[PDB]
Design a protein around this ligand. Structure first.
Ligand code: CLA
Ligand code: CLA
Ligand code: CLA
Ligand code: CLA
Ligand code: CLA
Ligand code: CLA
Ligand code: CLA
Ligand code: LHG
Ligand code: BCR
Ligand code: PQN
Ligand SMILES: CCCCCCCCCCCCO[C@@H]1O[C@H](CO)[C@@H](O)[C@H](O)[C@H]1O
Ligand code: SF4
Ligand code: SF4
Lengths: 154, 119, 146, 741, 80, 59, 38
């Protein structure tokens, strides 16, 4: 059963064990060593690390699990970086497709791919920002796809 | 060309095959007379029965245990190849008498080595 | 991966520590540490310079099947024409030597064609693979129990 | 005669041809219609005897390229001196070296990886050095951070002189070929000028820097009371206290009363019992012996003054009867073909690097080097590995000579091709020696494996069982015990403490123990002779069957990196002189993997470890070699199962980056097999079946996406098999010995 | 024998015969192309089957297609 | 190094003169390099004789 | 003059873009480390 992670026992056992275990090296230095300040910053980055995983679900393992159902209580877990990611490589993919359908109609398409025309490249890098309703409106013209390309025997 | 000299030819020419005329039972009996005395050796000192008093008999039984495979392969080689009947070593009958000579001379060499592990 | 996964699941049930699995199976050193290194301990102790026990057959089969699995790579990696121009050197070495050029072959010595080469490398890959893992399943679970 | 004719303003220095990739090859300036142009661009980036047959233009290209290599090496050593300066704990390491583990690289604090900063002491953390730079700096006498900063900045200065030198010697002053075929002068200046003045000037550094400094650090002086090497030459008085022969000046030198220089120079050998290194009196005296001996050696090549040899009149004079013509032609081979010179120099360079490894483990020449065992291990191992690879470079570039630059007119009945007349008798007897040593080097291991597995340990090859005590190595090692009284008359101790007397300990750490060789060490030496003979088989089969085999009688008409001929002759895959080098790299991995698996486990059983009260002994595995190296289950269990345990449990600690470079190197090793086993007849229409999925969405790439070629599609399997295979033993070894030593 | 067949795409550029190091291939005057030539393989008893012809066959797709057939002494290319 | 009576420079000039006696033979031209090469060789021989004479026995 | 063509090639712009997005990941993981939400 996925307990809420802020109250799970083995979670806070890992809190005591890692703050104490990393803290064992912190007594190897004086009060004004640069390493001692670095492990001050590291202990801060462990208490923040465990307070910022409060609303997750760590089960009996004491390790924060995830949920990928789109439950809308786990939306910040999976689906918000899911839609975020699909926007980012939809950006990248529409940039690359748009640049290849640029260099397909140029003088010499071979030299276009070694030496990227950074004018027209950085045109398409930035212009491919709104690929759902630009790739979709280039799909409604019947132009994202193709037909009767290369194939083997049958 | 080189390693083809007259000392090479004079050593190879009187070997127990390249010598001119010997009956194939004796021509193989010389081969077995050497090898049967040989193969007793690497079973007495290094064999598994070097710990009991069967140090010397296990060389006989193990070595003839090789020799039956050796003459068996001799009969396979003269059985498959050397099809004609020119009656010499390149035949069937001369090769199987070469193999029988190697067997009887090999077992005789085994008994000679066994009776010379006495002294 | 299927039978490694099943086997490291039921070695965690039968020993009892399922928490040993669930905490240490989502990273690869959990597998290689907590399963292969730990559970080959009764396998690889199958015979010592101190002595042996009943699992010496499975550890001897274990090392054996690593040798099979690595003789596969001699055929899979290193293809024919190396050996097709090396069996010619051996055939010169037998055609030219005295006391044995009498014993000449009937079927001519030819390196294995590459339909066969990738096959026999495949066969030693499977025999070595499957005998290694049948050595490890039985030596492992027979070592943690019985 | 000797004269230097130099073309000026050879090549203009605009960035125009950087915009033309593949400008250099007219076979490749067509531009990429396929993606194989991308990889052929890099496979022809240094085929200098494939750009143009004109050896002048080639020779300018290579000779300018060497300065680029030395520029990268001076950037590398300036990097090591700066990471010694700003980032290392070397100043604190100089106080107590046996307690403080050496660290330079201080990992930047991003997510997690700040835990790699190992608290190695010195008050400052960071990942631990295994390269052994601090031992060479204590030997060289670098006291504080200032010489590391300044020597780093001089490293960048020489890097600028090598970039400017290479630009200067390709573009605006580049020589003729008559400068290059003036080779008696080249030997005449490299034997004498490079190595002679190198060892002589280094004897200057050791006598006027290291002998006072590593006398004071041998006396245990803190690195603040130590004066600068500066201050030992303003007056002889600070050195006459340390070495009282400096008071006499150079006067006993010029009167040849060299008995007086027993303070500065001696012949003692052994090791320093305090620092665990060689006596720098012996090492400075040694570099004087290389000094006078190489300056003698340089002057045997007639250049302008009609005094000295020429190589032609030497090689003609050995007109032996069993070779017929003698060495006629080799001065014309080695001064017209670069690849043959690269074969010789990579063979002797690689075998020198192996010699370096074997001379560094047993005579540890740096102070406190044998104390920290990871620097003792990895400087054996690293120089063993480059010392391996360079021999395969000999086996490749010998074949690149034999395919391209062979000409039977200059090379007719001499010592060279008379081998190739009986190359069947060369390769056939290598074939026999390989089978005989394989049976008698590994069949003994299957024997002891079975006899230990069959219970009958009375039938093994141990000391208790049927022994195989190495007779010859123990006898000559016993001669090396009896050297310094009998034959090395003016010595005191032996050549090493791997030979003779009782062990040398520094800080309760065993610096060197006399190595015992019984009946298991024997069989591993036959492993090494075996897998050396197999690489010699593949790398002589790669050269004698390079140009015209009896399988394929036109290979020079096909080339060097051709994949094959075809399925004819029943299949002729992998038959080129390159493909034997493809095989010799795997056997390089085998041969050196069991060299270092002999090293790092015999010397974790027979040498290294600690010493306790009353001089009592303790090894790391605890004498667990001769009862365990005889089998393979003892080898795999007691070595690869047991020594892995400090690499595998290394998580949550500073050794966990080796726990990442262990698994990832298993990944790269396993990832090579995809390239080795399959071939482009699969991947080309797998890829083209993906090209359908790009042609459907108009994402057809204009450079056509081929698969790799065959020779690239096996060269990359080598270069992953070796990167993953070598980095496994890398992470295993450094995570083993850092975790204890 | 390794059956060599030479189809009607053979436009007679003769890189095949120059590419065959066995002279199984010759050129035959055939009035169906611009060069008037079309290659022939009469002596396939010596045909190794190394497919060095098919590398240097600049037709549309392989006018000369080598089918790997019989394996004699000569067609296996063994020296001894 | 002592004066005219027998010492280390006494056994050097004999090495120099047998060195140039080699220099009359080893491409015995009468140039500079007969002396600069051959007096150097007899100089090497003289240094090999002085201290090799110093270790085993009387100087 | 033609250096900017060399700074428009495939590997150089590959390093000047993967170096840049690499710096986006590292500079976005120094400022907000341990980011499993959102
Ligand atoms: C122009 C950019 C571009 C675009 C839009 C696509 C799109 C596609 N590829 Mg892909 N591909 C690309 C480049 C691209 N590819 C490159 C450069 C390679 C060589 C590594 C591949 C190798 C490849 C394989 C092997 C496969 C696909 C497949 C696919 C399809 C499924 C999506 C997927 O998993 O992608 C796969 C994505 C990758 C393998 C990694 C992405 C490749 C690079 C890193 C990103 C591309 C950005 C591009 C270089 C930007 C250049 C332009 C810009 C400078 C102006 C989809 C149509 C699959 C398919 O057929 O499904 C139907 C499939 O099996 N691709
Ligand atoms: C005694 C003079 C001398 C010295 C010291 C060297 C030294 C070297 N030569 Mg070299 N060479 C010489 C004479 C000399 N050469 C002559 C006369 C010829 C023509 C016959 C050549 C032909 C030659 C070739 C063809 C090659 C070398 C190479 C090398 C380098 C080998 C790498 C190495 O050991 O790095 C150790 C590095 C050092 C020890 C640093 C050395 C720098 C110091 C300051 C000496 C350099 C002085 C410089 C030569 C004087 C030029 C005069 C000019 C400024 C007016 C090394 C720097 C190889 C190389 O890498 O190319 C550069 C190479 O391929 N040499
Ligand atoms: C572990 C796998 C493995 C093994 C055992 C071998 C073994 C061998 N390779 Mg090799 N090779 C391998 C992997 C392997 N390779 C891989 C992965 C590559 C990839 C690059 C190569 C590439 C390669 C090349 C390129 C060459 C070899 C060659 C050889 C032979 C060297 C001669 C020798 O040692 O004879 C001794 C034999 C052994 C040690 C094998 C064990 C034999 C035991 C000890 C005795 C017999 C067992 C048993 C009694 C048999 C009877 C029972 C049975 C009939 C029922 C040898 C058979 C060379 C060759 O052709 O021969 C010279 C050669 O040129 N190999
Ligand atoms: C190749 C390495 C090797 C070697 C040297 C040995 C050696 C041995 N094994 Mg063995 N073994 C090996 C591999 C090897 N094994 C492997 C790979 C396996 C597993 C497949 C086994 C499995 C095995 C078992 C199961 C047993 C042994 C046993 C033995 C011992 C007795 C066997 C015997 O009678 O020899 C027979 C020897 C010969 C027939 C001699 C032939 C060779 C001669 C010397 C060649 C001479 C030629 C000459 C030099 C030519 C030049 C001179 C001429 C020109 C005049 C012996 C010590 C037995 C034992 O109890 O151990 C004590 C036993 O039970 N072995
Ligand atoms: C063949 C093996 C061998 C080796 C490697 C050496 C090596 C050496 N001997 Mg030596 N020596 C040998 C046999 C050997 N000796 C024998 C058989 C004798 C008896 C005639 C001597 C008598 C001898 C003397 C008398 C001296 C050397 C010295 C030396 C050292 C200086 C180099 C040299 O000889 O000039 C060097 C370590 C010298 C030395 O100890 O200086 C370090 C020295 O004075 N040796
Ligand atoms: C004829 C006079 C003479 C005498 C008595 C010696 C005597 C000696 N020489 Mg010697 N030497 C001589 C001439 C002589 N040399 C000449 C002409 C040369 C050529 C320059 C050399 C070059 C030479 C070298 C290179 C070495 C000796 C060494 C030695 C010593 C040990 C030799 C040994 O192992 O036995 C010994 C004291 C060795 C030694 O240990 O020196 C102390 C040593 O390494 N000698
Ligand atoms: C090309 C990638 C890249 C990008 C986008 C940034 C972006 C940024 N860096 Mg930066 N940085 C980079 C590479 C990059 N850096 C590299 C390679 C280094 C090492 C030399 C640094 C070293 C660095 C420092 C030392 C600092 C920044 C800072 C900053 C921020 C100031 C605005 C900004 C987010 C500043 C900041 O806000 O950090 C606190 C700051 O102080 N950067
Ligand atoms: C080394 C001893 C070899 C005796 C050969 C003596 C020798 O080389 O004499 C030199 C002889 C060449 O005779 P010539 O008088 O013509 O030689 C002068 C000319 O070579 C110079 O132009 O070469 C041979 O006869 C080749 C025989 C190779 C036969 C195989 C020998 C290699 C097997 C031994 C490998 C052992 C290596 C390990 C060493 C322990
Ligand atoms: C090291 C060496 C060598 C080698 C060795 C060898 C090779 C040996 C051999 C030897 C041998 C190997 C011997 C043999 C022996 C034998 C004898 C002396 C004979 C006798 C006879 C017999 C055996 C008989 C038998 C029999 C019998 C008994 C009965 C009846 C039947 C018969 C008749 C069969 C040489 C010399 C080369 C050289 C030098 C060195
Ligand atoms: C997988 C495989 C391939 C396919 C390998 C493909 C063709 C190469 C994949 C890696 C390249 C580098 C991808 C190209 C992507 C570019 C780098 C652009 C990406 C954008 C940035 C990363 C710069 C072979 O061509 C092959 C050939 C012969 C034997 C075995 C094999 C084989 O096993
Ligand atoms: C019979 C008269 C003999 C005189 C001997 C003098 C011996 C030294 C000759 C050079 C004189 C100067 O001495 C040098 O002093 C400097 C420093 O002053 C040092 O190099 C050495 O001591 C001498 O080289
Ligand atoms: S087929 Fe191709 S190769 Fe053979 S001739 Fe016609 S064109 Fe030349
Ligand atoms: S098959 Fe081999 S030999 Fe016959 S033609 Fe084609 S390539 Fe030449």
């Amino acid at each position: 059963v996925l307990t809420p992670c802020q109250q799970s026992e083995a979670f806070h056992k890992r809190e005591i064990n890692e703050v104490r275990t990393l803290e064992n090296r912190q007594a190897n230095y004086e009060a004004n060593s640069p390493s001692y300040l670095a492990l001050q910053s590291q202990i801060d980055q462990v208490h923040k690390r465990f307070d910022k995983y409060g609303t997750l679900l760590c089960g009996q393992d004491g390790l924060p699990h995830l949920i990928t159902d789109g439950d809308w209580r786990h939306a910040r877990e999976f689906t918000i970086p899911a839609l975020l990611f699909l926007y980012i490589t939809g950006w990248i993919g529409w940039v690359g497709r748009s640049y290849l359908k640029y260099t397909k109609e140029t003088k010499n398409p071979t030299e276009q791919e070694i030496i990227l025309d950074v004018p027209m490249a950085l045109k398409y890098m930035l212009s491919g920002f709104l690929w759902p309703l630009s790739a979709w409106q280039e799909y409604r013209s019947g132009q994202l796809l193709a037909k009767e390309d290369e194939i083997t025997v049958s | 060309p080189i390693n083809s000299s007259s000392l090479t030819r004079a050593y190879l020419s009187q070997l127990p095959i390249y010598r001119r005329g010997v009956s194939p039972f004796l021509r193989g009996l010389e081969i077995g007379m050497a090898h049967g005395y040989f193969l007793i050796g690497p079973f007495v000192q290094l064999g598994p029965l070097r710990n009991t008093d069967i140090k010397y008999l296990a060389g006989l039984l193990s070595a003839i245990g090789l020799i039956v495979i050796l003459t068996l392969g001799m009969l396979l080689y003269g059985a498959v190849s050397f099809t004609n009947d020119s009656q010499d070593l390149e035949s069937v009958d001369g090769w199987r008498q070469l193999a029988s000579g190697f067997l009887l001379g090999a077992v005789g060499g085994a008994g000679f080595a066994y009776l010379l592990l006495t002294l | 991966w299927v039978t490694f996964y099943w086997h490291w699941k039921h070695l965690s049930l039968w020993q009892g520590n399922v928490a040993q699995f669930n905490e240490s199976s989502t990273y690869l050193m959990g597998w290689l540490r907590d399963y292969l290194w730990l559970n080959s301990s009764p396998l690889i102790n199958g015979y010592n310079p101190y002595g042996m026990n009943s699992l010496a057959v499975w550890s001897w089969m274990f090392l054996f099947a690593h040798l099979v699995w690595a003789t596969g790579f001699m055929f899979l990696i290193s293809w024919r024409g190396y050996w097709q121009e090396l069996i010619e050197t051996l055939a010169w070495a037998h055609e030219r030597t005295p006391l044995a050029n009498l014993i000449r072959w009937k079927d001519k010595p030819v390196a294995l064609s590459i339909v066969q080469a990738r096959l026999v490398g495949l066969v030693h890959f499977t025999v070595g693979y499957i005998l290694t893992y049948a050595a490890f399943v039985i030596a492992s679970t027979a070592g943690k129990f019985s | 005669q000797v004269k230097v004719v130099v073309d000026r303003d050879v090549v203009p220095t605009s960035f125009e041809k950087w915009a033309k990739p593949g400008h250099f090859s007219r076979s490749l300036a067509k531009g990429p219609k396929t993606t194989t142009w991308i990889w052929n661009l890099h496979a022809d980036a240094h085929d200098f005897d494939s750009h143009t047959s004109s050896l002048e233009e080639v020779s300018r290209k290579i000779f300018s390229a060497h300065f680029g290599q030395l520029a990268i090496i001076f950037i590398w050593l300036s990097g090591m001196y700066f990471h010694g300066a700003r980032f290392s704990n070397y100043v604190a390491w100089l106080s107590n070296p046996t307690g403080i583990k050496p660290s330079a690289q201080v990992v930047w604090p991003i997510v997690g990886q700040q835990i790699l900063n190992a608290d190695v002491g010195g008050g400052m953390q960071g990942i631990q050095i295994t390269s052994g730079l601090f031992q060479l700096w204590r030997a060289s006498g670098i006291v504080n951070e200032l010489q590391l900063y300044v020597t780093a900045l001089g490293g960048l200065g020489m890097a600028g002189l090598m970039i400017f030198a290479g630009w200067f010697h390709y573009h605006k002053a580049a020589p003729k070929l008559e400068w290059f075929q003036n080779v008696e002068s080249m030997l005449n200046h490299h034997l004498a000028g490079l190595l002679g003045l190198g060892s002589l000037s280094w004897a200057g550094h050791q006598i006027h820097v290291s002998l006072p400094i590593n006398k004071l650090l041998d006396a245990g002086v803190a690195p603040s009371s130590i004066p600068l090497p500066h201050e030992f030459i303003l007056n002889r008085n600070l050195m006459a206290e340390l070495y009282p022969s400096f008071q006499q000046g150079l006067v006993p030198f010029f009167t040849l009363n060299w008995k007086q220089y027993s303070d500065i120079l001696t012949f003692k050998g052994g090791l320093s019992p305090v620092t665990g290194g060689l006596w720098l009196t012996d090492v400075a005296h040694h570099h004087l012996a290389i000094a006078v001996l190489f300056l003698v050696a340089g002057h045997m090549y007639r250049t302008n003054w009609g005094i000295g040899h020429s190589i032609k009149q030497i090689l003609e004079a050995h007109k032996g009867p069993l070779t017929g013509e003698g060495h006629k032609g080799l001065y014309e081979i080695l001064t017209t073909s670069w690849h043959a010179n690269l074969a010789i120099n990579l063979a002797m360079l690689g075998s020198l690097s192996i010699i370096v490894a074997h001379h560094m483990y047993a005579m540890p020449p740096y102070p406190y080097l044998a104390t920290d065992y990871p620097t003792q291990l990895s400087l054996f191992t690293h120089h063993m590995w480059i010392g391996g690879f360079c021999i395969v470079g000999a086996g490749a570039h010998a074949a690149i000579y034999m395919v391209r630059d062979y000409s039977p007119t200059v090379n007719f009945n001499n010592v060279l091709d008379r081998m190739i007349r009986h190359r069947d008798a060369i390769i056939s007897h290598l074939n026999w020696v390989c089978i005989f040593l394989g049976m008698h080097s590994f069949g003994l291991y299957i024997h002891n494996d079975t006899m230990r597995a069959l219970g009958r340990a009375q039938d093994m090859f141990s000391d208790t069982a049927i022994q195989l005590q190495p007779v010859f190595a123990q006898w000559i090692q016993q001669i090396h015990t009896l050297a310094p009284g009998n034959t090395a008359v003016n010595a005191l101790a032996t050549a090493s403490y791997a030979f003779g007397a009782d062990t040398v300990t520094v800080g309760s750490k065993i610096a060197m123990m006399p190595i015992k060789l019984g009946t298991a060490d024997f069989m591993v030496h036959h492993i090494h002779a075996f897998t050396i003979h197999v690489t010699t088989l593949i790398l002589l089969k790669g050269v004698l069957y390079a140009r015209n085999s009896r399988l394929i009688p036109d290979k020079a008409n096909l080339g060097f990196r051709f994949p094959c001929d075809g399925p004819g002759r029943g299949g002729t895959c992998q038959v080129s002189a390159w493909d034997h080098v493809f095989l010799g790299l795997f056997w390089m991995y085998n041969a050196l993997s069991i060299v270092i698996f002999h090293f790092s486990w015999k010397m974790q059983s027979d040498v290294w470890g600690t010493v306790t009260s009353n001089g009592a002994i303790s090894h790391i595995t605890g004498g667990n070699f001769a009862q365990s190296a005889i089998t393979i289950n003892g080898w795999l269990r007691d070595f690869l199962w047991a020594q892995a345990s400090q690499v595998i449990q290394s998580y949550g600690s500073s050794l966990s980056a080796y726990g990442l470079m262990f698994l990832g190197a298993h990944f790269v090793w396993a990832f090579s097999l995809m390239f080795l086993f399959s071939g482009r007849g699969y991947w080309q229409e797998l890829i083209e079946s993906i090209v359908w999925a790009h042609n459907k969405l108009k994402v057809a790439p204009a450079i056509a996406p081929r698969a790799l070629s065959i020779t690239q599609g096996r060269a990359v399997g080598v270069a992953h098999y070796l990167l993953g295979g070598i980095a496994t033993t890398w992470a295993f070894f450094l995570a083993r010995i850092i975790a204890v030593g | 024998a390794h059956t060599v067949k030479i189809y009607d795409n053979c436009i007679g550029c003769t890189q095949c015969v120059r590419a065959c190091p066995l002279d199984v291939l010759e050129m035959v005057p055939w009035d169906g192309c611009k060069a008037g030539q079309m290659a022939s393989a009469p002596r396939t008893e010596d045909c190794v089957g190394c497919k060095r012809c098919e590398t240097a066959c600049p037709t549309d797709f392989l006018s000369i297609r080598v089918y790997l057939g019989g394996e004699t002494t000569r067609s296996m290319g063994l020296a001894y | 190094m002592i004066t005219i009576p027998y010492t280390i420079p006494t056994i050097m000039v004999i090495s120099n003169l047998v060195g140039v006696a080699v220099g009359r033979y080893a491409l015995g031209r009468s140039d500079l390099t007969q002396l600069i090469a051959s007096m150097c060789f007899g100089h090497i021989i003289g240094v090999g004789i002085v201290l090799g004479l110093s270790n085993m026995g009387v100087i | 003059m033609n250096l900017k063509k060399y700074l428009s090639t495939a590997p150089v712009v590959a390093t000047l873009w993967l170096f840049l997005t690499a710096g986006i990941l590292i500079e976005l993981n120094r400022f907000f480390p341990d980011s499993l939400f959102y």
